[PDB]
């Protein structure tokens, strides 16, 4: 009797203890976080999931290690196209070639709102579809109750935009995000801190935060850091640097090592001082520099313009391109290229699709940045763009009908060096890089350098190495050997274009094999030349990286990558890591700040 | 042309400025706050509305001046009845008269949860009905999105509850509040800081905060306070004290004035030090003391027991009650009284309805507070309750059949003084008052006193003054004059009970008029005697109040009262005023802390 | 008893100074300030936030703060500012700008 009732008493005592436990413990809940990448080629959503924890008398915070990308959405229109379309309608067609009174454009602010609305509705539909498809009903309840912070950040595409247009657009973009469709129940919200243009330096810093976070090099716990006898927290492992080559710009980011000698002209960033990371995180002094015109699309347009305006390459209407394969031929233009099933290359005539449009638009005498600044005019003229001429002739490669590939890798490297990496004057729209002390890529490793390991990122940068690895031209364990890379690329780039029944083919010189010719690999040799040039510049630095790695992705704890490389995770971390500020903005004010 | 387009430009510029304004300004939103009064006679909901404000980088807070009561709900069962019913079923009937092994009751914790559930569902239904009826659709959206903090606090009814029962009940009450019906969409939530028993001293302190808040005496802004040359914030007007007489206990609260001489045995509370008010509020040292058995219901039972066990009043089965009118007669019991249409008084026989049940239940040899403590046993025996006897004889007024009113006010005052205000031993269940240095009401003004103005509150306390004012026995501008009150009450209380066709009547001695005899005024003369006794004790103090006011309510800025007097507003303020803590618990953790 | 904070700031004279020289000099200047003569009893002290070169923009911003402070245009109290119905604090008087030619 007494033994059995003592157990019954213990069940009642347990029932109370289980409830005491519930009201004393921390409770975990799922939150969705949205990063809208307003890049040069497109505007795309990035839907993330994170675990939030609420503790009695401590508030709510995000576990930074729980941040995972659920999906990167569809590639919708870039903000540049939205604005230029608006100008076409309200300033009139060919505003690129005429003086425009910017003051008059203020009467068309509601119309800019209507144009922006169209894009915002597509992004909202895409975000909601991703959320509806990935979450279960219990997850949706949590995600819907917590609120969904939105961080729409613009990069190189509208970085060089003229007048007040872009900043007025941001005010409208935030208003649209703050008024989501009530039907879906997802409570999206933003503020001027989350949704804004980000500098190239910030863009680079955020990609550096992403890399070190995912690879477990960056952390604040005993596993990733150590506190010395003088109370200074050091990272347990070396923080790695990053080279990121996107569509319009390229970012070079590296932490500075102990006893680093910097000239007064070079401006390095302290992560804590510049409020990128909280005080509890290990300190670092980081060089972050971004170069406009160094992206895949923008350098392709600029390289063609410069190379085919050079008499060493332009003769009798034929521009001899050493960065293109033997047997490859295209119309002499910077228009978007399509490798057709018949082996022919079709150059798109649409001005909006021409890789020189952003540069030729910037380089105009009707842009106050050119008309008032000889400096900028001279940079434009140095790349064969006369800002005094209409848009059509600024984009035109004069007395040039056909571009023919010569497949000469060393000539390609030589030209990539003189045009892109080490030009006489800084490439246009680079006042930010110049202000931090760097006119060009060649100056980055001359003025500052580090033993910090380096990661090379970007779609083209990886395709360059992976292509050479696939044809067994490079070893699988390639660690950055310059001569090994140049020798491999010299062989691959001397390949002939053969037009076969199953479509065009890239034929390797010594029966080494072959691959299909397409719109993504036709000009890969320019990127290999960029890689070679970059590696030579890093190799010349006073301090060389401990190692160089090419990575598509970083594996998570379960062997599967939790998120992509890039600035997106970094921007999230930059806000969520400041616990108090995040609690106030994300939870205290929250989506309810928008209530009618 | 230029004048008209300049205006069109100004409309576009305005559109942007309006949006910049929205994303820079503070935004106001409506929140509902719920206070559940778990009192001695009942458990009732109190639904409040408040204006919250969210500012960029400042979080969210409540404007304390916006706190308004929307409705006080229905009187559902008190927590004492829930627990005693549970004991009746699981410890067996008449557990009040037998030894009970409390350890064995642990096996019935789920059953206590089921009993508590029944009451919680009624309170939730009542709260939701009030919210649905008072709010419009835009208000409901705000109220539903913000979350609804619930503060269920118990007072005198279960303050003296035996064993571990009450605290186990609170764990269950919180779990029930944290799991509301999902159907209504109102997100109710609590935690151990909001939902808990409150001491009599806290209860008094909260009623003091309510009074001074509503009357605009308490404040932190230049309108209600001033900062001196030494950085000390003083209230602009004197903070007033409060006497609150409820159903089971009476609270006496007053701030201490400059250079106040306190004996080491008297424990005064500092509002800031004891964390009742934040640092930004003016400081005050407050005497707060609560007396069990001084409430309307509890003193009525105790007074009858004591008076009718006295040979000066009990003779030949007739107890002569000087606190009852000439011609009034009732059965000799402390059972609930009903003045019937025929003029007869029906005494309820139900043990749960007897005004002595709480005291006779406390005063038991099977209660460890009596069996281990001679002190407590002696206090019980001093009020004619033998703790060794069964419940039925502890509640019984021995050799007494009929109570007859003598309408002798001075004899009534004399008895209220000896029984209630200045007893030989402290009235039972008063260890809290005794610990703060006060055994009885008479000791409060002897040991501590203040020039601070005083407010007299409670349903009966006000009816006492208002009755005498209505019959023109007291002037409309009555300011506390003892002799004026005693002279008025002596006249009113010498009234005869006449049984008329339209029902029973209270006939005033010198054709002064009349009023109906009912269940609420039959024993009002005891309360008038309590008032007289209290006023004499305050008048004897070293420092006397600047003024004494009887108030039913305090008028708001629009001439209409925003809330009632009592501890409810005070408990809200005690939590909402600590901005950071409130933001973390109410908004950061919020109702989402409960998400599955 | 309170200690004497020292703010040594350099302006246009060494703003255009080449190589690493100036920044190495600042590290030495701070060490010197942090080691005053014990004889006089005045406790001078600095840190890298107080003692450093200031940019032309900071120099201008600081002169703007000086002007508005002294002229009573800049303040957070009711005399120099007003909180609107939306909780935003505005300066009561227009903040003035500055042209400083050194
Ligand atoms: Mg990008
Ligand atoms: Mg009460």
C43-62 residues touching B, CB cutoff 8 A: none
Instruction: Name the phi and psi angles at B157, rounded to 5.
Output: -55, -45
Residue A455 CA to residue A215 CA, distance in Å, equals 11
Q: Is B151 in contact with B575 (CB distance < 8 Å)? A: yes
Six-digit token string for A530:
């960029």
Dump strand ranges (E) for B293-370: 314-315, 317-321, 329-331, 337-339, 345-347
Contact between residue A196 and residue A170 where contact means Cβ atoms under 8 Å apart: yes
Residues of A catalogued as catalytic:
203
How many CB atoms are closer than 10 A to CB B273?
9
Task: Please give the helix or strand (H or E) that residue A46 lies within, else none.
Answer: strand A43-55
Nearest to A106 among B9, B110, B141 (CB): B9
Considering CB atoms only, which of B171, B584, B585 is closest to A16? B171
- Window 98-157 of B: residues touching A by CB (8 A cutoff) are 103-110, 113, 138, 141-142, 145-146
| Paired tokens of A51 | 């675990």
CA distance A491 to A474: 11
DSSP class of B326 = B
Task: Give which of A31, A65, A33 is closest to A47, Cα–Cα.
Answer: A33
In the block, tokens 């709510």 appear at: A60
How many CB atoms are closer than 10 A to CB B98?
13
Nearest to B157 by CA among B329, B273, B38: B38
**Contacts with A9 from chain B: Cβ below 8 Å:** 103-104, 106-107
Burial class (CB in 10 A: 0-12, 13-18, 19+), B207: buried
DSSP state of B83: H
Tokens of A237: 């492992």
Asked if B215 and B242 touch (Cβ cutoff 8 Å), the reply is no
For B481-542, strand residue ranges (E) read 496-500, 503-507, 514-516
d(CA B51, CA B57): 19
The residues, any chain, with a CB within 8 Å of residue A93's CB and separated by 6 or more, are none
C80: tokens are: 């120099």
A109, A591, A593, B542, C48 from A596: Cα distances, Å? 23, 11, 9, 57, 47
d(CA B68, CA C72) in angstroms, rounded, equals 41
Residues 6+ apart with CB under 8 A from A224: A216, A217, A218, A235, A236, A237
Q: In 3D, which of A326, A215, A220 has the Cα closest to residue A277? A: A220
Please give the Cα distance from B114 to A289 (Å, whole number): 66
Task: Say how far apart CA A418 and CA A425 lie, in whole Å.
Answer: 11
Q: Give the C-alpha distances (Å, rounded to integers) separating B237 from A372, B209, B413, B449.
A: 66, 14, 35, 19
Number of CB atoms found within 10 A of residue B560's CB: 9
Q: Which two tokens stand for residue B70?
A: 């929307």
Sheet with B314-315, edge to edge strand ranges: B314-315, B317-321, B400-405, B329-331
What beta strand segments (E) does A88-130 contain?
A: none
- Please give the radius of gyration of chain C, using alpha carbons only, rounded to the nearest integer: 19
In units of Å, what resolution does this entry have?
2.4
Closest by Cβ to B592, choosing from A22, A146, A581: A146
Which chain C residue's Cα is nearest to B55? C87
> What method did the depositors use to determine the structure?
X-ray
A311 contacts A345 by C-beta, under 8 angstroms:
no
Q: Is B223 exposed, middle or buried (0-12, 13-18, 19+ CB in 10 A)?
A: exposed
Which residue do the tokens 């979350």 mark?
Answer: B147
- Tokens representing A496 are 């002939």
Secondary structure (3-state) at B63 = coil
**Residue partners of C83: CB distance under 8 A and separation at least 6:** C89, C90
Q: Are the CB atoms for A47 and A129 separated by under 8 Å? A: no
Question: What is the DSSP annotation of A131-195?
Answer: HHHH--HHHHHHHHHH-EEEEEEE-HHHHT--SSHHHHHHHHHHHHHTS--STT---EE--TTTS
Q: Do domains A1-198+565-596 and A199-564 have the same CATH topology?
A: yes
CB contact under 8 A, C78 and B222: yes
Q: Which helix (H) or strand (E) holds A287?
A: strand A285-292
Cα C57 to Cα B568: distance, rounded to the nearest angstrom: 55
* Token output for C12: 């246009």
DSSP secondary structure of B186-231: --EE--TTTSEE--HHHHHHHHHHHHHHHTT-S-SSTTTEEE-TTS
Mapped onto helix, strand or coil, the DSSP state of residue A55 is strand
Any chain A CB within 8 A of the CB of B26?
Answer: no
The gap between the terminal CA atoms of chain A, to the nearest Å, is 64
If you search the block for the tokens 């069940």, which residue do you land on? A11
The residues, ordered by sequence, that sit 6+ positions from A6 with a Cβ below 8 Å of its Cβ are none
Whole-angstrom distance, CA of residue A340 vs CA of residue B500? 112
Looking at A186-232, which runs of residues are DSSP E strands? 188-189, 196-197, 225-227
The two tokens of residue B480 are: 């506390």
Query: Which single residue is written with the structure tokens 């009357």?
Result: B215
- Separation between Cα atoms, residue A211 and residue A550, nearest integer Å: 12
Task: Tell me the C-alpha distance between A355 and C92, whole Å.
Answer: 52
Whose CA is closest to B439, among B424, B417, B454?
A: B424
- Whole-number Å distance between alpha carbons of B570 and B561: 16
Burial grade of B93 (CB within 10 A; 0-12, 13-18, 19 or more): exposed
Nearest C-alpha neighbor of A440 from the set A461, A453, A422, A416: A422
Q: Are strands A188-189 and A68-72 parallel, antiparallel or unpaired?
A: unpaired
Which residues of C fall within a CB distance of 8 Å from A262? 20, 23
**Burial zone of B469 (CB within 10 Å; 0-12 exposed, 13-18 middle, 19+ buried):** middle
**Start-to-end C-alpha separation, chain B:** 64
DSSP state of A348: P
- How far from the centroid of its chain's Cα atoms is residue B80's Cα? 16
End-to-end CA distance of chain C: 36
Using CA atoms, how far apart are residues B251 and B61, in angstroms rounded to an integer? 31
List CB contacts of C11: < 8 A, sequence separation 6 or more: C53, C54, C59, C102
In this structure, which topology does domain A199-564 adopt according to CATH?
A: Nucleotidyltransferase; domain 5 (3.30.420)
| Biggest alpha carbon–alpha carbon distance for chain A | 110
Pairwise CA distance, residues A452 & A545, whole Å: 5
**Closest Cα to residue B289, out of B82, B490, B445, B472?**
B445
Residue of A426, A360, A362 lying closest to A396 (CA atoms)? A360
Encoded tokens for A63: 């576990």
Residues 6+ apart with CB under 8 A from A7: none
Which residues lie below 8 Å from residue A130, measured CB to CB, with a gap of 6+? Answer: A45, A47, A70, A71, A73
> Do residues A157 and A38 lie in contact, with contact meaning Cβ atoms separated by under 8 Å?
yes
**Would you call C87 and B24 a contact, using CB atoms and an 8 Å cutoff?**
no
In chain C, the residue whose alpha carbon lies closest to the alpha carbon of A260 is C20
Q: How far is CA C7 from the centre of its chain?
A: 7
Which chain A residues are closer than 8 Å to C17 by Cβ? 264
What element of type H or E holds B4?
helix B2-22
Helix B296-307 vs helix B524-539: crossing angle, to nearest 10: 100
Sign of the torsion angle spanned by Cα atoms A140, A142, A144, A150: negative
* Neighboring chain B residues of C87 at a CB cutoff of 8 Å: 25-26, 53, 55
Task: Indicate the angle between helix axes B296-307 and B409-416, nearest 10 degrees.
Answer: 100
- A15, A168, A585: residue with CB nearest B109: A15
3 state DSSP class of C60: helix
In contact, A549 and A462? CB cutoff 8 Å: no
In the numeric block, which tokens belong to residue B324? 């009852």
Distance CA B159, CA B173 (A): 16
Q: Across the interface, which of B21, B26, B222 has its CB nearest the CB of C87?
A: B26
CA distance C56 to chain A (A): 14
Under DSSP, the state recorded for A277 is S
Whether B589 and A19 lie within 8 Å, measured CB to CB: no
- Which residues, in sequence order, are CB contacts of A260 under 8 Å at separation 6+? A285, A448, A450
How far apart are the C-alpha atoms of B569 and B37, rounded to whole Å?
A: 11
Residues B199/B436, Cβ–Cβ less than 8 Å:
no
- Catalytic residue numbers of C read 59
Distance CA A381, CA A373 (A): 13
- Strand partners of residue B457: B244
Q: What is the DSSP string of A486-542?
A: HHHHHHHHT-EEEEETTEEEEE-TTS--EEE--TTTTTHHHHHHHHHHHHHHHHTSS
Secondary structure (3-state) at B373? coil
Closest C-alpha among A551, A487, A497 to residue A523: A497
Within B453-506, residue ranges assigned H as helices are 459-470, 482-493
Domain ranges of chain A: 1-198+565-596, 199-564
- Quote helix, strand, coil % in chain A, to nearest 5: 40, 20, 40
User: E-strand spans in B296-343?
Assistant: 314-315, 317-321, 329-331, 337-339
Does the distance separating the beta carbons of A264 and C19 come in below 8 Å?
yes
Give CA–CA dist B101/A323, Å, rounded. 94
Alpha-carbon dihedral of residues A319, A324, A329, A332, nearest 10 degrees?
-40
CA A259-A264-A267 angle, 5° bins: 80
Contacts of A59 in chain B (CB under 8 A): 583-584, 588-589
Helix (H, G, I), strand (E, B) or coil at A563: coil
Q: Are strands A148-154 and A196-197 parallel, antiparallel or unpaired?
A: parallel
Q: How far apart are CA B84 and CA B91, in angstroms?
A: 10
CA of A154 to the centre of ligand 1 (A): 9
The answer to whether B203 is a known catalytic residue is: yes
- Alpha-carbon gap, residue C33 to C44, rounded angstroms: 6
Q: Is the dihedral of CA B308, B313, B316, B318 positive or negative?
A: negative
What is the three-class DSSP state of A7?
A: helix
Quick one: fold of B1-198+565-596?
Nucleotidyltransferase; domain 5 (3.30.420)
Residues in chain A: 596
The Cα A268–Cα A274 span in angstroms is: 10
Distance A289 CA to ligand 1 centre (A): 14
Q: Do A263 and C19 touch (CB under 8 A)?
A: yes
DSSP state for residue B257 in the 8-state scheme: P
Q: Which residue has the tokens 């642990």?
A: B106
Closest CA to B286 of B264, B259, B249, B257: B257
What is the rounded CA–CA span in Å between residue A321 and residue A416?
11
CA distance A128 to A122: 10
């Amino acid at each position: 009797v007494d033994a059995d009732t003592e157990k019954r008493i213990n069940v009642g005592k347990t029932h109370l203890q289980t409830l005491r436990n519930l009201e004393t413990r921390c409770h975990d809940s799922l939150q969705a976080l949205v990063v809208i990448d307003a890049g040069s080629s497109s505007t795309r959503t990035n839907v993330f999931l994170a675990k939030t924890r609420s503790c009695p008398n401590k508030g709510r915070s995000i576990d930074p290690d729980s941040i995972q990308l659920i999906r990167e959405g569809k590639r919708f229109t870039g903000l540049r196209v939205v604005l230029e379309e608006w100008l076409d309608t309200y300033a009139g067609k060919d505003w690129e070639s005429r003086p425009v009174d910017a003051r008059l454009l203020f009467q068309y602010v509601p119309q800019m709102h209507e144009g922006a609305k169209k894009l915002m509705q597509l992004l909202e539909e895409d975000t909601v579809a991703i959320l509806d498809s990935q979450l279960n009903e219990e997850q949706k309840v949590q995600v819907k109750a917590l609120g969904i912070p939105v961080m729409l950040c613009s990069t190189a595409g509208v970085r060089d935009f003229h007048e007040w247009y872009r900043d007025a657009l941001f005010v409208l973009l935030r208003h649209l995000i703050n008024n989501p469709s009530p039907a879906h129940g997802y409570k999206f919200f933003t503020n001027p801190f989350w949704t804004r243009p980000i500098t190239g330096a910030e863009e680079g810093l955020f990609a550096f935060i992403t890399l070190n976070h995912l690879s477990r090099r960056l952390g604040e716990d005993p596993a990733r850091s150590m506190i010395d006898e003088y109370g200074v927290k050091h990272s347990r492992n070396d923080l790695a640097g990053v080279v990121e080559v996107g569509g319009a710009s390229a970012q070079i980011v590296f932490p500075l090592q102990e006893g680093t000698v910097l000239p007064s002209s070079v401006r390095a960033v302290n992560l804590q001082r510049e409020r990128l990371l909280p005080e509890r995180y290990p300190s670092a002094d980081v060089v972050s520099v971004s170069f406009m015109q160094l992206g895949m699309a923008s350098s392709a347009g600029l390289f063609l313009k410069e190379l085919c305006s050079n008499d060493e390459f332009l003769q009798g209407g034929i521009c001899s391109n050493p960065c293109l394969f033997k047997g490859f031929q295209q119309s002499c233009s910077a228009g978007e290229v399509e490798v057709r099933p018949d082996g022919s290359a079709s150059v798109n005539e649409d001005v909006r699709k021409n890789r020189l449009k952003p540069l030729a638009t910037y380089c105009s005498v009707h842009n106050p940045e050119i008309s008032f600044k000889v400096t900028n005019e001279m940079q434009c003229r140095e790349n064969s763009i006369d800002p005094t001429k209409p848009l059509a002739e600024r984009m035109k490669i004069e007395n040039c009908s056909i571009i023919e590939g010569t497949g000469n890798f060393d000539k390609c490297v030589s030209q990539v060096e003189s045009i892109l990496v080490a030009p006489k004057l800084p490439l246009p729209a680079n006042i930010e890089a110049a202000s931090s002390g760097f006119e060009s890529v060649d100056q980055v490793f001359r003025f500052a350098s580090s033993t910090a390991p380096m990661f090379i990122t970007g779609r083209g940068m990886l395709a360059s190495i992976d292509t050479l690895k696939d044809h067994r031209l490079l070893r699988s364990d390639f660690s950055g050997d310059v001569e090994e890379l140049a020798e491999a690329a010299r062989e691959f780039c001397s390949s002939e274009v053969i037009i076969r029944t199953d479509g065009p083919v890239i034929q390797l010189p010594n029966a080494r094999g072959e691959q299909k010719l397409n719109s993504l690999n036709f000009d890969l040799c320019k990127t290999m030349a960029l890689t070679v040039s970059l590696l030579r510049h890093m190799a010349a630095g006073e301090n060389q990286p401990s190692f160089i790695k090419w990575e598509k992705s970083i594996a998570g704890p379960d062997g599967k990558p939790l998120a992509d490389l890039g600035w997106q995770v970094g921007v999230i971390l930059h806000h969520v890591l400041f616990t108090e500020e995040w609690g106030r903005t994300a939870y205290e004010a929250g989506y309810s700040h928008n209530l009618e």
